[PDB]
Symmetry: C2
Subunit: 120 residues, 2 copies
């Protein structure tokens, strides 16, 4: 149920393939419809989740470098997939920028994203 296209609630989208043994691969687009905002996504998921109605744990990383931009930063999303009628991937994220050692305490932003199969 993970493979396919997902949309956060702010205008981003990603397209992921879930491999049989736990691989996540795909592309993250920070702005729907803007190909210059597409970045490689790689991660992992639990490929044998519990059957008791629990979500499926997963995570992935985007380093914010492509052929048009290098923000010298990377974001990780940690969360769980919940299937069904209103399938969602609920996540929290960490965005770390490369910094000098003096600025290392300002290196990491935190936030959250909810991904759905339909646009907000």
């Amino acid at each position: 149920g993970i493979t396919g296209t997902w949309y956060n609630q702010l205008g981003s989208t990603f397209i992921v393939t879930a491999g049989a043994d736990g691989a996540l691969t795909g592309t993250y687009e920070s702005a729907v419809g803007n190909a210059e905002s597409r970045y490689v996504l790689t991660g992992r998921y639990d490929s044998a989740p519990a059957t008791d109605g629990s979500g499926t744990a997963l995570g992935w990383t985007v380093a914010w470098k492509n052929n048009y931009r290098n923000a010298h930063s990377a974001t990780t999303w940690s969360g769980q997939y919940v299937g069904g009628a209103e399938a969602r991937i609920n996540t929290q994220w960490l965005l770390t920028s490369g910094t000098t050692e003096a600025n290392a305490x300002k290196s990491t932003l935190v936030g959250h994203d909810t991904f759905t199969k339909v646009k907000p």
Copy 2:
């Protein structure tokens, strides 16, 4: 400078290869020397970092399933590599467990790891 073996300060280790265009691939071992605690690691790094002494941003994920255990959870590490004599990878991590919807607010632990090229005392 990233490719190789790293140790956190609590007894874990990982071995990563940094590909030329930003891939991180490797194995994470929660307990040094215990092969049944080895898990696949996949992530990304900035393969053209700033040259001004800034660290190199990176992140990776481990899903805690292998042939011996399935914790139904996954951890992501977000941080930066700093090279030199005492090279380190400074990170913060998120550990999310699959939960029921009623327990979803108890799903995600947060913490930090500092990885070095040599083992802690």
